[PDB]
């Protein structure tokens, strides 16, 4: 049940979601832990606060460290696409 969610932000704000990683074939270390109120992740509202992300901008991140995913989204631009799983 992998639903794909694009997140459009402005240049003044961020996407407004926090990724929590746990530190690997059947492992999903990264998920959503919180959502900043009044953020594009809150307005798009397609993210639940327990969604395990499989990929970021069409790039598998299950075997990717936390810092690399942060750097990936940090350069992603004003739109990012997460492949997620609800919870």
């Amino acid at each position: 049940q992998t639903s794909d969610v694009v997140i459009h932000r402005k240049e003044n704000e961020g996407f407004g979601f926090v990724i929590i990683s746990s530190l690997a074939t059947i492992t999903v270390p990264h998920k959503i832990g919180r959502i900043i109120d009044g953020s594009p992740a809150d307005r798009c509202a397609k993210l639940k606060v327990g969604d395990r992300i499989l990929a970021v901008n069409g790039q598998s991140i299950i075997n990717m460290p936390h810092a690399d995913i942060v750097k990936l989204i940090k350069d992603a631009g004003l739109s990012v696409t997460l492949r997620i799983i609800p919870q």
């Binding site: 979601f17 926090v18 990683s21 832990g33 919180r34 810092a67 942060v70 989204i73």
Partner: peptide, 9 residues
């Protein structure tokens, strides 16, 4: 825990 990383984006 100590083996976890939270960072907002």
């Amino acid at each position: 825990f100590g083996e976890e990383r939270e960072s907002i984006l």
